[PDB]
Design a protein around this motif. Structure first.
Motif, PDB file in Angstrom:
ATOM      1  N   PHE A 244       6.844   0.136   2.294  1.00 48.03           N
ATOM      2  CA  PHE A 244       5.238  -0.358   2.844  1.00 48.03           C
ATOM      3  C   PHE A 244       4.524   0.020   1.586  1.00 48.03           C
ATOM      4  O   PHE A 244       3.890  -0.434   0.611  1.00 48.03           O
ATOM      5  CB  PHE A 244       4.959   0.638   3.652  1.00 48.03           C
ATOM      6  CG  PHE A 244       3.749  -0.283   4.167  1.00 48.03           C
ATOM      7  CD1 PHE A 244       3.190  -1.834   4.522  1.00 48.03           C
ATOM      8  CD2 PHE A 244       1.977   1.066   4.034  1.00 48.03           C
ATOM      9  CE1 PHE A 244       2.191  -1.729   5.327  1.00 48.03           C
ATOM     10  CE2 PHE A 244       1.944   0.454   4.017  1.00 48.03           C
ATOM     11  CZ  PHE A 244       1.133  -0.697   4.995  1.00 48.03           C
ATOM     12  N   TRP A 245       4.624   1.500   0.969  1.00 43.95           N
ATOM     13  CA  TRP A 245       3.611   1.672   0.176  1.00 43.95           C
ATOM     14  C   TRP A 245       4.182   1.362  -1.257  1.00 43.95           C
ATOM     15  O   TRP A 245       3.067   0.556  -1.808  1.00 43.95           O
ATOM     16  CB  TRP A 245       3.231   3.071   0.223  1.00 43.95           C
ATOM     17  CG  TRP A 245       2.954   4.255   1.514  1.00 43.95           C
ATOM     18  CD1 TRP A 245       3.843   5.015   2.118  1.00 43.95           C
ATOM     19  CD2 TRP A 245       1.271   3.707   1.487  1.00 43.95           C
ATOM     20  NE1 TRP A 245       2.893   5.152   2.804  1.00 43.95           N
ATOM     21  CE2 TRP A 245       1.531   4.339   2.740  1.00 43.95           C
ATOM     22  CE3 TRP A 245       0.783   2.927   1.004  1.00 43.95           C
ATOM     23  CZ2 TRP A 245       0.420   4.472   3.386  1.00 43.95           C
ATOM     24  CZ3 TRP A 245      -0.441   3.049   2.088  1.00 43.95           C
ATOM     25  CH2 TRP A 245      -0.681   4.044   3.497  1.00 43.95           C
ATOM     26  N   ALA A 246       5.793   0.317  -1.026  1.00 40.13           N
ATOM     27  CA  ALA A 246       5.782   0.341  -2.375  1.00 40.13           C
ATOM     28  C   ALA A 246       5.484  -1.591  -3.044  1.00 40.13           C
ATOM     29  O   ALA A 246       5.029  -1.544  -3.955  1.00 40.13           O
ATOM     30  CB  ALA A 246       7.389   0.582  -2.995  1.00 40.13           C
ATOM     31  N   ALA A 247       5.292  -1.846  -1.856  1.00 44.18           N
ATOM     32  CA  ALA A 247       5.507  -3.136  -1.175  1.00 44.18           C
ATOM     33  C   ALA A 247       3.684  -3.503  -2.246  1.00 44.18           C
ATOM     34  O   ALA A 247       3.081  -4.325  -3.103  1.00 44.18           O
ATOM     35  CB  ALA A 247       5.039  -3.781  -0.656  1.00 44.18           C
ATOM     36  N   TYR A 248       2.281  -2.109  -1.502  1.00 48.06           N
ATOM     37  CA  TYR A 248       0.711  -2.641  -2.689  1.00 48.06           C
ATOM     38  C   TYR A 248       1.289  -1.230  -3.273  1.00 48.06           C
ATOM     39  O   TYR A 248      -0.397  -1.653  -3.098  1.00 48.06           O
ATOM     40  CB  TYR A 248       0.793  -2.028  -0.611  1.00 48.06           C
ATOM     41  CG  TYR A 248       0.386  -3.600   0.378  1.00 48.06           C
ATOM     42  CD1 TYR A 248       0.126  -4.569   0.072  1.00 48.06           C
ATOM     43  CD2 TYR A 248       1.281  -3.530   1.063  1.00 48.06           C
ATOM     44  CE1 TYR A 248       0.692  -6.139   0.770  1.00 48.06           C
ATOM     45  CE2 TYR A 248       1.788  -4.056   2.459  1.00 48.06           C
ATOM     46  CZ  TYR A 248       1.021  -5.319   1.938  1.00 48.06           C
ATOM     47  OH  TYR A 248       0.896  -6.247   2.631  1.00 48.06           O
ATOM     48  N   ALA A 249       1.454  -1.653  -3.776  1.00 42.92           N
ATOM     49  CA  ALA A 249       1.762  -0.057  -5.052  1.00 42.92           C
ATOM     50  C   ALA A 249       0.527  -0.465  -6.090  1.00 42.92           C
ATOM     51  O   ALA A 249      -0.469   1.137  -6.179  1.00 42.92           O
ATOM     52  CB  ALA A 249       2.683   0.673  -5.564  1.00 42.92           C
ATOM     53  N   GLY A 250       0.116  -1.812  -6.336  1.00 42.40           N
ATOM     54  CA  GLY A 250      -0.509  -2.143  -7.496  1.00 42.40           C
ATOM     55  C   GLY A 250      -2.170  -2.164  -6.456  1.00 42.40           C
ATOM     56  O   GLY A 250      -3.527  -2.416  -6.949  1.00 42.40           O
TER      57      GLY A 250
END
Length: 136
Positions: free
Chosen positions: A33-39
């Motif tokens: 989840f956090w990786a999909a939104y890292a930017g």
């Protein structure tokens, strides 16, 4: 057995426009989840909800069809949706300029409202206008 998460996405564009989008997501892997939104930047998180913000390296879609630069206030450069009238609503204000210093045609263009439809055009006009800011 997933976590249900209401995601809100705030996109902030170079013109000062903001858009808000909703998603409903099911989280199996937290780290995925956090990786999909890292930017994205986290504005708020609760149980079941996240709001993220991201500065987009572009002007907004609505600015691409309605986007003007004009002058408001005391000689303040502003982006506007639709050609400025002085009871019109600036998306964002940026700097003061000295309008006495502008060449006559350029002054008229600005006073009518200068259309932009692309990122390049937007920052071309701002850069141009930035010449006329500073103390007298």
């Amino acid at each position: 057995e997933p976590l249900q998460v209401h995601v809100q996405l705030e996109k902030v564009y170079l013109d000062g426009d903001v858009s808000i989008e909703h998603k409903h997501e099911k989280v199996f892997s937290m780290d995925d989840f956090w990786a999909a939104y890292a930017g994205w930047t986290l504005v708020e998180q609760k149980k079941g909800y996240v709001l993220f913000r991201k500065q987009m390296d572009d002007i907004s879609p609505l600015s691409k069809v309605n986007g003007y630069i004009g002058v408001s206030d005391n000689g303040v450069i502003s982006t506007f949706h639709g050609r400025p009238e002085p009871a019109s609503e600036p998306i964002q204000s940026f700097f003061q300029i000295d309008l006495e210093r502008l060449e006559s045609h350029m002054q008229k263009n600005l006073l009518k409202g200068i259309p932009f439809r692309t990122k390049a055009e937007f920052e071309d006009v701002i850069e141009h206008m930035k010449t006329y800011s500073g103390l007298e």
